[PDB]
Amino acid sequence: GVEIETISPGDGRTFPKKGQTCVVHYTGMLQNGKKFDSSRDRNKPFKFRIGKQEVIKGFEEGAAQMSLGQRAKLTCTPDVAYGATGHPGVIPPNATLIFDVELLNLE
């Protein structure tokens, strides 16, 4: 379950394909909570590739459903990343995570 609410400007066609190292200015958020992880805070815009399951499934499926320039808004389900496990100190178990994802990519 990935609910994409794209803020309109972009190109609408440059989709991430397999093995494409793509660039996302991500900015995390918790449902009824604050930020937890931000490439914008690090100013290191997270050059990640598609097809290795490096990123979580809530962040991976949101990438290919966007295009270059687009600014979507992830509402990631708990069961795809940390719903029963939970990260120690960052992500509690059964958290519905929120992301400011703007696909300004490469390749």
Tab-separated table of N, CA and C in Angstrom:
chain	number	residue	atom	x	y	z
A	1	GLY	N	0.795	-1.213	0.000
A	1	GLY	CA	0.000	0.000	0.000
A	1	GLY	C	0.830	1.268	0.000
A	2	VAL	N	0.886	1.932	-1.150
A	2	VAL	CA	1.571	3.210	-1.296
A	2	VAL	C	0.571	4.218	-1.838
A	3	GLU	N	0.273	5.241	-1.043
A	3	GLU	CA	-0.646	6.302	-1.433
A	3	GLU	C	0.162	7.523	-1.841
A	4	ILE	N	0.160	7.816	-3.135
A	4	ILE	CA	0.962	8.880	-3.722
A	4	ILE	C	0.080	10.100	-3.941
A	5	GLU	N	0.498	11.236	-3.388
A	5	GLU	CA	-0.167	12.519	-3.604
A	5	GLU	C	0.881	13.469	-4.171
A	6	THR	N	1.045	13.449	-5.489
A	6	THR	CA	2.099	14.205	-6.151
A	6	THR	C	1.719	15.675	-6.236
A	7	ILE	N	2.550	16.533	-5.659
A	7	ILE	CA	2.501	17.949	-5.991
A	7	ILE	C	2.974	18.099	-7.430
A	8	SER	N	2.114	18.680	-8.265
A	8	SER	CA	2.091	18.627	-9.728
A	8	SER	C	3.383	18.829	-10.535
A	9	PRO	N	4.273	19.811	-10.274
A	9	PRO	CA	5.327	20.090	-11.261
A	9	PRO	C	6.390	19.004	-11.335
A	10	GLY	N	6.782	18.693	-12.569
A	10	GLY	CA	7.731	17.637	-12.863
A	10	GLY	C	7.885	17.438	-14.358
A	11	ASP	N	8.034	16.191	-14.811
A	11	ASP	CA	7.986	15.939	-16.249
A	11	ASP	C	6.999	14.823	-16.577
A	12	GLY	N	6.734	13.958	-15.603
A	12	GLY	CA	5.711	12.942	-15.744
A	12	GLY	C	6.103	11.705	-16.520
A	13	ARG	N	7.354	11.590	-16.969
A	13	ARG	CA	7.745	10.453	-17.794
A	13	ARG	C	9.058	9.781	-17.409
A	14	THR	N	9.974	10.456	-16.718
A	14	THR	CA	11.283	9.871	-16.425
A	14	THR	C	11.126	8.987	-15.195
A	15	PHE	N	10.698	7.795	-15.408
A	15	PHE	CA	10.470	6.857	-14.326
A	15	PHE	C	11.765	6.143	-13.968
A	16	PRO	N	11.974	5.829	-12.694
A	16	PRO	CA	13.117	4.990	-12.332
A	16	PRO	C	12.930	3.573	-12.848
A	17	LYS	N	13.945	3.080	-13.543
A	17	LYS	CA	13.954	1.714	-14.040
A	17	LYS	C	14.951	0.904	-13.216
A	18	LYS	N	15.122	-0.358	-13.597
A	18	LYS	CA	15.951	-1.276	-12.828
A	18	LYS	C	17.426	-0.928	-12.966
A	19	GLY	N	18.116	-0.875	-11.830
A	19	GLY	CA	19.524	-0.534	-11.816
A	19	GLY	C	19.838	0.927	-12.026
A	20	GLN	N	18.833	1.796	-12.062
A	20	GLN	CA	19.048	3.224	-12.239
A	20	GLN	C	19.322	3.863	-10.886
A	21	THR	N	20.542	4.361	-10.710
A	21	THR	CA	20.889	5.120	-9.520
A	21	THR	C	20.156	6.452	-9.554
A	22	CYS	N	19.171	6.603	-8.678
A	22	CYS	CA	18.264	7.737	-8.716
A	22	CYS	C	18.362	8.529	-7.418
A	23	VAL	N	18.027	9.812	-7.518
A	23	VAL	CA	18.336	10.806	-6.496
A	23	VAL	C	17.025	11.349	-5.944
A	24	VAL	N	16.882	11.322	-4.617
A	24	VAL	CA	15.668	11.756	-3.931
A	24	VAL	C	16.042	12.632	-2.743
A	25	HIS	N	15.505	13.854	-2.723
A	25	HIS	CA	15.560	14.724	-1.550
A	25	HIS	C	14.463	14.286	-0.583
A	26	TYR	N	14.728	13.210	0.155
A	26	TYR	CA	13.661	12.729	1.017
A	26	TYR	C	13.676	13.476	2.346
A	27	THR	N	12.513	13.489	2.992
A	27	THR	CA	12.350	14.131	4.292
A	27	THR	C	11.305	13.334	5.058
A	28	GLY	N	11.745	12.607	6.082
A	28	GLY	CA	10.853	11.707	6.783
A	28	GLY	C	9.986	12.421	7.802
A	29	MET	N	8.938	11.721	8.232
A	29	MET	CA	7.969	12.237	9.188
A	29	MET	C	7.198	11.056	9.759
A	30	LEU	N	6.787	11.161	11.016
A	30	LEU	CA	5.908	10.168	11.615
A	30	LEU	C	4.477	10.687	11.616
A	31	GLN	N	3.521	9.777	11.395
A	31	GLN	CA	2.112	10.062	11.648
A	31	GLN	C	1.928	10.492	13.093
A	32	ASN	N	1.465	11.737	13.277
A	32	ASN	CA	1.304	12.380	14.588
A	32	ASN	C	2.623	12.398	15.354
A	33	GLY	N	3.707	12.624	14.616
A	33	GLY	CA	5.048	12.635	15.154
A	33	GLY	C	5.913	13.555	14.323
A	34	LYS	N	7.183	13.641	14.701
A	34	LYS	CA	8.100	14.561	14.045
A	34	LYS	C	8.948	13.812	13.020
A	35	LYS	N	9.935	14.513	12.466
A	35	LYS	CA	10.891	13.953	11.529
A	35	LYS	C	11.741	12.879	12.195
A	36	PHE	N	12.248	11.965	11.373
A	36	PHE	CA	13.199	10.962	11.843
A	36	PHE	C	14.408	10.792	10.942
A	37	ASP	N	14.316	11.109	9.653
A	37	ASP	CA	15.427	10.923	8.735
A	37	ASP	C	15.226	11.870	7.563
A	38	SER	N	16.277	12.611	7.217
A	38	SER	CA	16.161	13.606	6.166
A	38	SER	C	17.476	13.724	5.418
A	39	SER	N	17.434	13.451	4.117
A	39	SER	CA	18.532	13.808	3.233
A	39	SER	C	18.703	15.311	3.099
A	40	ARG	N	17.628	16.081	3.280
A	40	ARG	CA	17.724	17.534	3.241
A	40	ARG	C	18.526	18.081	4.411
A	41	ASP	N	18.399	17.464	5.587
A	41	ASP	CA	19.186	17.895	6.734
A	41	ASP	C	20.658	17.570	6.534
A	42	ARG	N	20.944	16.417	5.934
A	42	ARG	CA	22.324	16.062	5.648
A	42	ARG	C	22.850	16.780	4.415
A	43	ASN	N	21.943	17.337	3.597
A	43	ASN	CA	22.241	17.932	2.287
A	43	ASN	C	23.005	16.962	1.390
A	44	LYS	N	22.650	15.683	1.493
A	44	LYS	CA	23.271	14.582	0.763
A	44	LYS	C	22.119	13.796	0.155
A	45	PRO	N	21.728	14.095	-1.081
A	45	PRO	CA	20.390	13.696	-1.536
A	45	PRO	C	20.230	12.245	-1.966
A	46	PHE	N	20.870	11.314	-1.245
A	46	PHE	CA	20.542	9.885	-1.179
A	46	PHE	C	20.478	9.236	-2.571
A	47	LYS	N	21.646	9.169	-3.202
A	47	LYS	CA	21.748	8.567	-4.526
A	47	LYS	C	21.615	7.053	-4.410
A	48	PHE	N	20.408	6.537	-4.633
A	48	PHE	CA	20.125	5.122	-4.450
A	48	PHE	C	19.683	4.513	-5.772
A	49	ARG	N	19.891	3.210	-5.905
A	49	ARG	CA	19.528	2.501	-7.120
A	49	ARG	C	18.296	1.634	-6.893
A	50	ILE	N	17.623	1.320	-7.996
A	50	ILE	CA	16.373	0.572	-7.994
A	50	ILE	C	16.683	-0.878	-8.343
A	51	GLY	N	16.156	-1.803	-7.549
A	51	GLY	CA	16.273	-3.216	-7.835
A	51	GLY	C	17.157	-4.008	-6.902
A	52	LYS	N	17.557	-3.435	-5.766
A	52	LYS	CA	18.424	-4.115	-4.815
A	52	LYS	C	17.769	-4.288	-3.451
A	53	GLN	N	16.572	-3.717	-3.260
A	53	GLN	CA	15.867	-3.634	-1.972
A	53	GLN	C	16.735	-3.028	-0.874
A	54	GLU	N	17.563	-2.048	-1.247
A	54	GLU	CA	18.237	-1.215	-0.262
A	54	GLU	C	17.216	-0.440	0.551
A	55	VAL	N	16.384	0.334	-0.137
A	55	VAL	CA	15.311	1.094	0.478
A	55	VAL	C	14.179	0.158	0.874
A	56	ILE	N	13.318	0.619	1.779
A	56	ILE	CA	12.152	-0.142	2.204
A	56	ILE	C	11.127	-0.161	1.080
A	57	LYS	N	10.162	-1.078	1.177
A	57	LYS	CA	9.173	-1.249	0.119
A	57	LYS	C	8.227	-0.060	0.028
A	58	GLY	N	8.003	0.639	1.140
A	58	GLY	CA	7.201	1.846	1.088
A	58	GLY	C	7.909	2.993	0.397
A	59	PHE	N	9.240	2.987	0.410
A	59	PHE	CA	10.015	4.006	-0.284
A	59	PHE	C	10.421	3.553	-1.680
A	60	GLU	N	10.457	2.236	-1.916
A	60	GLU	CA	10.833	1.714	-3.227
A	60	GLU	C	9.679	1.809	-4.215
A	61	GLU	N	8.471	1.449	-3.777
A	61	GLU	CA	7.315	1.509	-4.663
A	61	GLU	C	6.892	2.944	-4.933
A	62	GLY	N	7.196	3.863	-4.015
A	62	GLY	CA	6.911	5.263	-4.265
A	62	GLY	C	7.845	5.891	-5.278
A	63	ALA	N	9.017	5.287	-5.493
A	63	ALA	CA	9.986	5.856	-6.426
A	63	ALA	C	9.581	5.634	-7.876
A	64	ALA	N	9.222	4.399	-8.241
A	64	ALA	CA	8.886	4.091	-9.626
A	64	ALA	C	7.544	4.678	-10.046
A	65	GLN	N	6.677	5.005	-9.093
A	65	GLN	CA	5.403	5.648	-9.380
A	65	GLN	C	5.528	7.156	-9.554
A	66	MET	N	6.725	7.707	-9.396
A	66	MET	CA	6.991	9.114	-9.633
A	66	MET	C	7.866	9.278	-10.864
A	67	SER	N	8.034	10.526	-11.287
A	67	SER	CA	8.917	10.859	-12.390
A	67	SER	C	9.804	12.021	-11.964
A	68	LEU	N	10.633	12.489	-12.898
A	68	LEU	CA	11.594	13.550	-12.612
A	68	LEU	C	10.892	14.871	-12.329
A	69	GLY	N	11.332	15.552	-11.278
A	69	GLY	CA	10.749	16.808	-10.888
A	69	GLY	C	9.555	16.700	-9.968
A	70	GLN	N	8.811	15.592	-10.032
A	70	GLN	CA	7.596	15.421	-9.245
A	70	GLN	C	7.895	15.400	-7.753
A	71	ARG	N	6.898	15.810	-6.976
A	71	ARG	CA	6.999	15.939	-5.526
A	71	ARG	C	5.809	15.191	-4.939
A	72	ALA	N	5.998	13.913	-4.633
A	72	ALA	CA	4.922	13.124	-4.061
A	72	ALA	C	5.009	13.139	-2.539
A	73	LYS	N	4.216	12.279	-1.906
A	73	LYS	CA	4.041	12.306	-0.459
A	73	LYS	C	3.709	10.891	-0.010
A	74	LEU	N	4.707	10.180	0.507
A	74	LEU	CA	4.502	8.797	0.907
A	74	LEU	C	3.733	8.705	2.217
A	75	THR	N	2.878	7.688	2.294
A	75	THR	CA	2.225	7.279	3.538
A	75	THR	C	2.496	5.780	3.629
A	76	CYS	N	3.651	5.435	4.182
A	76	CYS	CA	4.154	4.074	4.122
A	76	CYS	C	3.503	3.224	5.200
A	77	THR	N	3.047	2.041	4.808
A	77	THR	CA	2.422	1.121	5.738
A	77	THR	C	3.458	0.571	6.722
A	78	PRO	N	3.028	0.149	7.918
A	78	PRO	CA	4.005	-0.395	8.877
A	78	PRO	C	4.607	-1.723	8.455
A	79	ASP	N	3.807	-2.609	7.860
A	79	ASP	CA	4.223	-3.982	7.596
A	79	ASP	C	5.276	-4.113	6.501
A	80	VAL	N	5.560	-3.052	5.747
A	80	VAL	CA	6.592	-3.130	4.723
A	80	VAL	C	7.972	-2.745	5.246
A	81	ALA	N	8.055	-1.977	6.336
A	81	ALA	CA	9.357	-1.584	6.865
A	81	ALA	C	9.626	-2.093	8.275
A	82	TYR	N	8.844	-1.663	9.277
A	82	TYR	CA	9.194	-1.941	10.668
A	82	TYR	C	7.975	-2.159	11.562
A	83	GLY	N	6.901	-2.761	11.042
A	83	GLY	CA	5.651	-2.818	11.790
A	83	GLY	C	5.715	-3.694	13.028
A	84	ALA	N	6.335	-4.863	12.917
A	84	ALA	CA	6.460	-5.726	14.083
A	84	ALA	C	7.829	-5.578	14.731
A	85	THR	N	8.859	-5.321	13.926
A	85	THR	CA	10.202	-5.175	14.473
A	85	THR	C	10.376	-3.823	15.152
A	86	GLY	N	10.320	-2.744	14.379
A	86	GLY	CA	10.594	-1.434	14.928
A	86	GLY	C	12.080	-1.165	15.058
A	87	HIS	N	12.509	0.021	14.675
A	87	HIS	CA	13.926	0.294	14.846
A	87	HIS	C	14.202	0.773	16.270
A	88	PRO	N	15.310	0.354	16.872
A	88	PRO	CA	15.642	0.861	18.209
A	88	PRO	C	16.073	2.320	18.188
A	89	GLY	N	15.196	3.210	18.652
A	89	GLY	CA	15.514	4.608	18.829
A	89	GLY	C	14.997	5.537	17.748
A	90	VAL	N	14.606	5.010	16.591
A	90	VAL	CA	14.156	5.822	15.463
A	90	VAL	C	12.720	5.496	15.077
A	91	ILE	N	12.440	4.231	14.786
A	91	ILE	CA	11.123	3.841	14.297
A	91	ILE	C	10.478	2.867	15.273
A	92	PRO	N	9.370	3.229	15.904
A	92	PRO	CA	8.672	2.281	16.770
A	92	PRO	C	7.976	1.217	15.942
A	93	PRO	N	7.629	0.080	16.541
A	93	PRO	CA	6.823	-0.913	15.823
A	93	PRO	C	5.415	-0.403	15.544
A	94	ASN	N	4.889	-0.832	14.388
A	94	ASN	CA	3.557	-0.482	13.871
A	94	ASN	C	3.410	1.035	13.700
A	95	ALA	N	4.297	1.599	12.885
A	95	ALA	CA	4.294	3.023	12.579
A	95	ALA	C	3.960	3.224	11.111
A	96	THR	N	3.049	4.147	10.833
A	96	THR	CA	2.702	4.507	9.468
A	96	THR	C	3.510	5.740	9.081
A	97	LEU	N	4.565	5.533	8.296
A	97	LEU	CA	5.593	6.544	8.096
A	97	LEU	C	5.213	7.504	6.980
A	98	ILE	N	5.689	8.742	7.101
A	98	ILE	CA	5.370	9.828	6.183
A	98	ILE	C	6.676	10.346	5.593
A	99	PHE	N	6.677	10.616	4.290
A	99	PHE	CA	7.886	11.032	3.593
A	99	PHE	C	7.581	12.168	2.630
A	100	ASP	N	8.458	13.170	2.604
A	100	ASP	CA	8.446	14.187	1.557
A	100	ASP	C	9.434	13.749	0.485
A	101	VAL	N	8.923	13.118	-0.564
A	101	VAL	CA	9.746	12.526	-1.608
A	101	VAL	C	9.608	13.379	-2.855
A	102	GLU	N	10.722	13.943	-3.305
A	102	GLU	CA	10.774	14.687	-4.553
A	102	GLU	C	11.839	14.063	-5.439
A	103	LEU	N	11.400	13.436	-6.528
A	103	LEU	CA	12.271	12.663	-7.407
A	103	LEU	C	12.958	13.624	-8.368
A	104	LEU	N	14.161	14.052	-8.000
A	104	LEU	CA	15.037	14.839	-8.860
A	104	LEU	C	16.267	13.975	-9.100
A	105	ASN	N	16.161	13.065	-10.065
A	105	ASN	CA	17.032	11.902	-10.104
A	105	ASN	C	18.133	12.024	-11.155
A	106	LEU	N	18.907	10.953	-11.266
A	106	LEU	CA	19.902	10.742	-12.303
A	106	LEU	C	19.655	9.384	-12.945
A	107	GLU	N	20.403	9.123	-14.020
A	107	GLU	CA	20.324	7.910	-14.848
A	107	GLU	C	18.914	7.631	-15.370
